[PDB]
């Protein structure tokens, strides 16, 4: 356990949160996964739907790579404040928050190759403009848009981790 | 739970930790899977208590 402590101290020491991985190099590819816990308030009045998710982001950071410890280092969530994380934001959200009981539902997991997993439990209301002319014989398209606030494709690239299997739990969803 | 790093010896048998020191150590990151919105009461003072036994039991 001690050797892990000096390893983590080595990784965090001399770490600049202001600079992205491969700052001067090619863009960092950020894979994304979602697990849909629930979709609750599909409101026609407010033109929005409420959605709870486990939102995971994967990206390789060579600065955080370590050796000699053959296990995935799941660290306390507060270390997320010390590491660089992507500029991700939901474009069409109206009200979102991280669940914060008993603690902030965050997860930071480092891997020996330098991969960083950053997981968040997010409940967000998202705008869904509905064309209810055919109501109640109507079909709606409700979308969640994910975008980088302050980075372009030459700096950061998004992709769905696992292809079409990136988003899970939709099969288990049922609405009244 | 148990944390051998917080073992101690003294006249007492139980040590009550204030919230500032309670936030300075490791605690389980327990969360409710089916929770929609939860509140940890903070009225008058954070409604939380941490006790450490001499054997290291938290």
């Amino acid at each position: 356990m001690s050797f892990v402590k000096e390893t983590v101290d080595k990784l965090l020491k001399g770490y600049d949160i202001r600079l992205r991985p491969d700052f001067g190099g090619p863009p960092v590819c950020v894979g994304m996964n979602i697990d849909i816990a629930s979709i609750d308030m599909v409101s026609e009045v407010n033109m929005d739907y409420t959605l709870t998710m486990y939102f995971q982001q994967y990206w390789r950071d060579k600065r955080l790579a370590y050796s000699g410890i053959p296990l995935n280092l799941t660290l306390d969530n507060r270390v997320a404040d010390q590491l660089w994380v992507p500029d991700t934001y939901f474009l069409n959200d109206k009200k979102s928050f991280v669940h914060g009981v008993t603690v902030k539902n965050r997860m930071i997991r480092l891997h020996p190759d330098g991969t960083v997993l950053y997981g968040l439990r997010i409940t967000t209301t998202a705008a869904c403009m509905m064309d209810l002319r055919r109501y109640p014989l109507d079909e709606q398209n409700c979308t969640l848009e994910i975008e980088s606030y302050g980075y372009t494709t030459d700096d950061i690239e998004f992709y769905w981790r696992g292809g079409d299997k990136a988003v899970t739990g939709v099969e288990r969803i049922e609405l009244p | 739970w148990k944390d051998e790093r917080l073992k101690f010896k003294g006249p007492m048998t139980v040590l009550r930790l204030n919230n500032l020191m309670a936030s300075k150590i490791w605690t389980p990151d327990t969360f409710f899977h089916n929770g929609k919105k939860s509140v940890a009461h903070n009225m008058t003072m954070p409604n939380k208590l941490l006790r450490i036994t001499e054997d290291g039991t938290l």
Partner: nanobody, 108 residues
Framework: GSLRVSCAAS????????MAWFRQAPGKEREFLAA???????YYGDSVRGRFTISRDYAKNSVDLQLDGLRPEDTAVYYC?????????????????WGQGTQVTVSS
């Protein structure tokens, strides 16, 4: 020996229901084996903990039970059950739907 017992449900969508497997050896006692709920949370009996694995296909509305490490005493009739667990989740009375059953035998 290894085996896989599948259960396909028809006539109703069991997305919200707890799908479970029960065992009945000769002598007329029904034993809880495994169960999965809408949250993909797996409950198991003590006798078969770590041996049998329960999974669900919510799109296909089916539940599968993978049996590894079979022994002769596992010879029994296996029942597929579904229903919201009221007063239960380990009691047969809480399940309102049951399968025909499948006989499994093991020889040494």
């Amino acid at each position: 020996g290894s085996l896989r017992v599948s259960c396909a449900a028809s006539g109703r969508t069991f997305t919200t229901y707890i799908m479970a497997w029960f065992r009945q050896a000769p002598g007329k006692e029904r034993e809880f084996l495994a169960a999965m709920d809408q949250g993909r949370i797996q409950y198991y009996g003590d006798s078969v903990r770590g041996r049998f694995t329960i999974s669900r296909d919510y799109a296909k509305n089916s539940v599968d039970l993978q049996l590894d490490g079979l022994r002769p005493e596992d010879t029994a009739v296996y029942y597929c059950a579904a229903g919201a667990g009221f007063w239960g989740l380990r009691t047969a009375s809480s399940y309102h739907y049951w399968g025909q059953g499948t006989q499994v035998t093991v020889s040494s």
